[PDB]
């Protein structure tokens, strides 16, 4: 059988031009298709039959395929063009359809954005239920790297902490969440609890108390 190969990741400044390649043996005579997949969504066919574009796709997405390489060229790339790009052929030899391994596209050049932090204490409902859980909710930040520190009385706390990976919102910026589980006591024992998140060297803190 045949196997398609792509570079795992490709980077471009905004407004510049991105070239994504799809290597295969005599792929120049196979007809390549391209998909764009953004997190938690279905792929979208962006180019097919080597270089045809479905209705609704802009001419800035073009394609070519010759020899041992097909190429997806995206002109004037926008931040909205970050996705995984998959090439694909029908291989008559095996009678199988084959995907490339995918290419991450990143548009390094977006604006810095600081985390909005919101924090809640335990419910009495929860405490009467003999439990206690704190909720720190980081939103609206770029880039997608953020570190979260939990403080009780100016001391750090490790156990009970569960932090999500930076997910991606509608506004193409990121969001995460940390969850602090404690016994009803430890909550009542301490003067306060604070969730501090650091992004690009600056730190944003919020505090809560019984």
């Amino acid at each position: 059988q045949s196997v398609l190969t792509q570079p795992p990741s490709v980077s471009v400044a905004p407004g510049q031009t991105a070239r994504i390649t799809c290597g295969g043996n005599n792929i120049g005579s196979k007809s390549v298709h391209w998909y764009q997949q953004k997190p938690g969504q279905a792929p979208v066919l962006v180019v097919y039959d080597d270089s045809d574009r479905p209705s609704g796709i802009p001419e800035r997405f073009s394609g070519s395929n010759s020899g041992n390489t097909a190429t997806l060229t995206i002109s004037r790339v926008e931040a909205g063009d970050e996705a995984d790009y998959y090439c694909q052929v029908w291989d008559s030899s095996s009678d199988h359809v084959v995907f490339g391994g995918g290419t991450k596209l990143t548009v390094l050049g977006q604006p810095k954005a600081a985390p909005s932090v919101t924090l809640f204490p335990p419910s009495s409902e929860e405490l009467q239920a003999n439990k206690a859980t704190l909720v720190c909710l980081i939103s609206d930040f770029y880039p997608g790297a953020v570190t979260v520190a939990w403080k009780a009385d100016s001391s750090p706390v490790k156990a009970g902490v569960e932090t999500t990976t930076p997910s991606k919102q509608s506004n193409n910026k990121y969001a995460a969440s940390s969850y602090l589980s404690l016994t009803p006591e430890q909550w009542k024992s301490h003067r306060s609890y604070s969730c501090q998140v650091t992004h690009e060297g600056s730190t944003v803190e919020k505090t809560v108390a019984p």
Partner: protein, 218 residues
């Protein structure tokens, strides 16, 4: 309104099996092959195989042939896919996509997969379906906090709205965290004007759990 709608998330024990459905509408079902693509979490796309909605003939990727079974019922334009003897490796999103024109032809009239299902998440686990606790997250406070914490549930997913679809904007529902326990937990919270009973409609279908929770300031 050319469309493929797949059935909802499933959870099976290892060794079990699953049938997933994909319903076509907005075009003649028997005009295009139906394909299935696997995508495990964090992985890429894998072609599983296809089926002729007209004849019922099938074609399977090496990796998937033998323990996977694709069928169909033209009378309702639905493609089915069965996965037998499931293991943990099988946990994934499964798509149906529509690609390739009938009839056969010496050269495949295949122009890529132009229409896609929304995917079906199949989770393979021996864990028992458990309902979430839902606690109120009163606001402190301009804009206010207020929210709802859905705690220690299994399994994904869970669908929260606010005040029966009424309160939409401002509603931010966060992507869940996986706890050590094996249970998920997420929160939905509404920023609001400081200056109206606020209720969050939480519903965890897989455990037949639906709580309503009023969030009042302490």
């Amino acid at each position: 309104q050319v469309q493929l709608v797949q059935s909802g998330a499933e959870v099976k024990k290892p060794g079990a099996s699953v049938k997933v459905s994909c319903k076509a509408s907005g075009y003649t079902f028997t005009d295009y092959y139906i394909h299935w693509v696997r995508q495990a979490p964090g992985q890429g796309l894998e072609w599983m195989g296809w089926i002729h909605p007209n004849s019922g003939g099938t074609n399977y990727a090496q990796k998937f042939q033998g323990w996977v079974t694709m069928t169909r019922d033209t009378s309702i334009s639905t493609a089915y896919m069965e996965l037998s003897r499931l293991r943990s490796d099988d946990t994934a999103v499964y798509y149906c996509a529509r690609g390739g024109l009938e009839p056969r032809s010496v050269d495949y009239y295949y122009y890529g997969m132009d229409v896609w299902g929304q995917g079906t998440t199949v989770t393979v686990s021996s864990a028992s379906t458990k309902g979430p606790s839902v606690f109120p997250l009163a606001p402190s406070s301009g804009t206010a906090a207020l929210g709802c914490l859905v705690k220690d549930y299994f399994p994904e997913p869970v669908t929260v709205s606010w005040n029966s679809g009424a309160l939409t904007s401002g509603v931010h529902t966060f992507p869940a965290v996986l706890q050590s326990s094996g249970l998920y937990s997420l929160s939905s919270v509404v920023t609001v004007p400081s200056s109206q009973t606020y209720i969050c409609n939480v519903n965890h279908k897989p455990s037949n759990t639906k709580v309503d929770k009023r969030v009042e300031p302490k």
